Design a protein around this ligand. Sequence first.
Ligand SMILES: Nc1ncnc2c1ncn2[C@@H]1O[C@H](COP(=O)(O)OP(=O)(O)OP(=O)(O)O)[C@@H](O)[C@H]1O
Ligand SMILES: [Ca+2]
Ligand SMILES: [Ca+2]
Ligand SMILES: [Ca+2]
Ligand SMILES: [Cl-]
Lengths: 352, 121
Amino acid sequence: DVQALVVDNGSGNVKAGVAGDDAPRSVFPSIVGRPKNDAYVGDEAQTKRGILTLKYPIEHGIVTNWDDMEKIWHHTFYNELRAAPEEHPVLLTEAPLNPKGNRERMTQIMFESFNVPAMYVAIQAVLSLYSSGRTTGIVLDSGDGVSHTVPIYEGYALPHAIMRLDLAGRDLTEYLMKILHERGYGFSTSAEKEIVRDIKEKLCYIALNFDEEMKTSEQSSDIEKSYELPDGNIITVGNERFRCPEALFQPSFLGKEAAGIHTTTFNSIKKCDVDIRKDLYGNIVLSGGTTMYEGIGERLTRDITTLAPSTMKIKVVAPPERKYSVWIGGSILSSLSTFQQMWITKEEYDES
Amino acid sequence: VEHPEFLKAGKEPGLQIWRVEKFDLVPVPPNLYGDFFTGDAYVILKTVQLGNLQYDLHYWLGNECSQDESGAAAIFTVQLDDYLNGRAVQHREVQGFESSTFSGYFKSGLKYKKGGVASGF
Ligand SMILES: Nc1ncnc2c1ncn2[C@@H]1O[C@H](COP(=O)(O)OP(=O)(O)OP(=O)(O)O)[C@@H](O)[C@H]1O
Ligand SMILES: [Ca+2]
Ligand SMILES: [Ca+2]
Ligand SMILES: [Ca+2]
Ligand SMILES: [Cl-]
């Protein structure tokens, strides 16, 4: 009789909790701070930024500082969940196209540092598709550090068709910081960045037609919306509200030559054989925090409809809890009567 | 990956219906076949004798089913297909928009009921 722990590690935040809950009970920043002259994690690291050098162990969805990642996992088990990792099965998530060597390192740490008794590694986008009640579709997962388009057919990702875009929410926060200089604001420090991130989440939206929105917004002050800063000062944001997330569609705004999210989704579908494309176009599922902008579904629908053959039926699905759809999918999967047969046990791992 | 109901799946021509109940796959009483609770999600396996057997898996989502139920119905569909060596064709069926193939499995046609089993969430 044992309940699995579900941990979804992102570039910006970790989501953690117990199988069978409808949402993660723990969400904290994926940050490790160590003295400038042993380590602090998450919210406590930010409250001590003056004393610590802060680092992000996950870059563009890939674990890249293993020592600090181990600190994140220790904090998850001991300080957030108060769970003995050696006494629970664990479901852990990984990015699309995560190298097998990285999964192997993640597994070694879980079995040999934390002594987990059993573990299962799931692909984030696949969990999100399941949380939407689908086995076939294409997931557009846009987080803080990376965006992926992942075609999935009858339950399994098609690896040769997955796209990775390094543009995601943190680039958008930084772009908002940049364009607010037009108005005289000089947000630049790590703490100011977390304020601008909140402005972005509260005030931004995606225009249905960017050129037309620029024109209408210039004709009155109705575009302008206010935001109360921590110091009590008020900031007014205008067309920055939609110019900021427009960079998802026009990465040149950021000085990137990358294709936008609409083109990338189209290209990902085209990599799949023609006989399954209809099911992908009809099941474009949004996932992750950077897909939360008002207007995103309508805009993507227009733009992908333009690109795709006119015989296709384009349907963009925007689940309301999609900020946590990976974690939710993991909670469902690890609750099923069959999960016990999917995991790898420590004894199996240790004997090779 | 097995399960007692997996062991019974697709052994003979016919129609098998399971309801998702608290993260598990529970047989629907045969007297109820064709009636579907709008609050629930179900997995349906149609087995046809060709020499070999042909398999169509449908997962049916009621308009009021909870996220755990629709998610589990999708996952169990994948797992059943895997148990059938991938040879099943999977079909998503939404209340009121089901394929003619799926409706055709029920001589009395598809009908819906208010209610359903409690969410696992
Ligand atoms: N309502 C919102 N509107 C716009 N952006 C949002 C909203 N809510 C959260 N975000 C952005 O979503 C990002 C975090 O999303 P998520 O938690 O999916 O990323 P992650 O899993 O930490 O990162 P990744 O998946 O890139 O490794 C941040 O950039 C955050 O500002
Ligand atoms: Ca993520
Ligand atoms: Ca129900
Ligand atoms: Ca199949
Ligand atoms: Cl077109």
